[PDB]
Symmetry: D3
């Protein structure tokens, strides 16, 4: 699970699904050569969202964030490849889409903060934690 078999969790948020950017987002990961190892669309249960965002529980927007994230379907994915965690982090852009650079996903599609289209694990460790949280081992397919 290192080097070339490194993995990360990527999720298209409710705004991204409703604005119909799912294909657009996947093309960017595909053209970069990553391997799609797991994928599903679902309405995330608040219990999963709470653990996902557990370290923001204190923040005052935490309650609003949880409601928003469960307000519509989400598309969860697991991508595999060399440097996939840091590369995906660079592709998405700054949390604040309005400040994100053109060329990044938030920079080309969004202008909001909570509605910033996509999520990606911020570290190898966090990716291992998030992937176990959103996926059962049986849903991951290794090529």
């Amino acid at each position: 699970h290192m080097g070339t078999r490194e993995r990360t969790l990527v999720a298209v948020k409710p705004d991204g699904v409703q604005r119909r950017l799912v294909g657009d987002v996947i093309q960017r990961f595909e053209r970069r050569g990553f391997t799609l190892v797991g994928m599903k669309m679902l309405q995330a249960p608040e219990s999963v969202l709470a653990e996902h965002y557990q370290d923001l529980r204190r923040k005052p927007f935490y309650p609003a964030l949880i409601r928003y994230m469960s307000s519509g379907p989400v598309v969860a994915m697991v991508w595999e490849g060399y440097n996939v965690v840091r590369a995906s982090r660079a592709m998405i852009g700054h949390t604040d889409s309005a400040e994100a650079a053109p060329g990044t996903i938030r920079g080309d599609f969004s202008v909001h903060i909570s509605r910033n289209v996509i999520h990606a694990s911020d570290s190898v460790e966090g990716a291992q934690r998030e992937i176990q949280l959103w996926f059962q081992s049986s849903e991951l397919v290794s090529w």
Copy 2:
């Protein structure tokens, strides 16, 4: 009920290995259809056999099951007005080589065998296929 019509679309193992999933999904998205279900999975042979029961007594059935289980497939459920027939016209001819440019097979495939994608051929076929690949709790209506 008209605009509640649904259909099953699946990217075959070759479409996934060739990294055409985003390309495929994008075509349905810009046409205005709603994605109500989706998942990547290694298809079990019991599902393929039921999915392809009508070809069980035709030539090359074993080659067919072999291909469809040689790697993961991405199954999707799209919803929209006249979605069954429109999805049919969009994927094009079975024989990719003679599929018209502009359709998915005409733009991305060259073979009859490995033809990248599958779409239900009728409303009743769609109802059957959807129940076959998805549980009701996997479909989200938005």
Copy 3:
């Protein structure tokens, strides 16, 4: 005079709300046509009635005027060799659901009613429509 041929193209209210203006314009641009006039406007009913006078005695005329004035439209004048017939072939069948993939309706629309775009059906129709939506001082020849 051949390569001075002109036609009227208009993105309907649904095309604008769905944000397909760039997509539409891009298809005409890469085909090599010259954009000689363009503007976004909420169409006045007097203009629509004159534009659609031939449908005044057919079913659903009121539904037609209602749709076409439910939001802004983008009217354009394109110039080029055989532009009237080429623009016609590019937008595809009136019934979007049976429009061939590759045409604008076949790629972006699913309905007969809301079919995203309009293009003059003939040279004389184009001359009429252009005079209807634009003043001569709004056309720029480059």
Copy 4:
């Protein structure tokens, strides 16, 4: 006319129209979620151009700039949306296209300075001034 109803003026310059980049430019504003509120193609009158570029009147290239800008049709547009002024400014890139970053509009399409394809208001205040200058209130349509 604040927050979510913020507006800005965007213009495709003569080079952009002749090189047939109008569709390309509009797609980028559309995919980012902005709302097209006004639009027209015209040969700008030198009187409008002089006021538009009024604070460069002293510069020695000012006379050349005015001639160039009226040498061909221009497409003027008004876009509306949250943070639309700063977001549009980031999407266009550095005045000098050759130095503009890939992903920005000047960075992907141009390599010149006066022929840098596009213009966008540099501030909320300037946008209010420019929109009144290029458009009559009756040409703007609010959704």
Copy 5:
């Protein structure tokens, strides 16, 4: 040998001046064909005359040679299953104006004369054309 089939594709002078080379190559690439040879060159008249020997006794031959030598062309050799007929269907009708949208001529061209691209019309024609434009040491099989 089936998947060893080859064909000659060439972007005409207008396709190059209009900067459509990447667009053209991209369509063949996503279809899955393999590029085994390519070069940009100002075509010698002896090559054009041999390439177009069948049109030597038809109207407008001189206008044809003039156009094809008015600027550089990009010649390519693509390899793949049924590549001759598929490349034929992808470029579309000779008369660009009536070429279906989705094909290269239908999307990028409007004239019969200047129709952007050329593709061998048959397997034997392809063998002939390839030998005409390329030396064996310029073809790389990968």
Copy 6:
């Protein structure tokens, strides 16, 4: 051979050709307005590669690099235009693709170092040297 007639050498590496990114790469140079002045696909002879990469001969990866670069076909091109050398350099991105910015060619398509899809002359002087090395004068066509 200055200003507007400036030229540079661009090459699509073996990985770029096999992953079928040739069209993608050319579209980016075309849309920016450059003029394609020379082009050919070939299996570069180790003798050409050695001179191309001559100033890395001391490095320990030099031998591996030469083998890799001759392991498959390469597409060589000469592009002409104002500021074409510096503009092409900015379009390709950082040597390490994983660190390259989204929007650059390496930033959108690669995640490796030696397999970073493309090469571009790093200076006007180097471009003159590289173009003479890969092309004979008769293969270049001026419009």
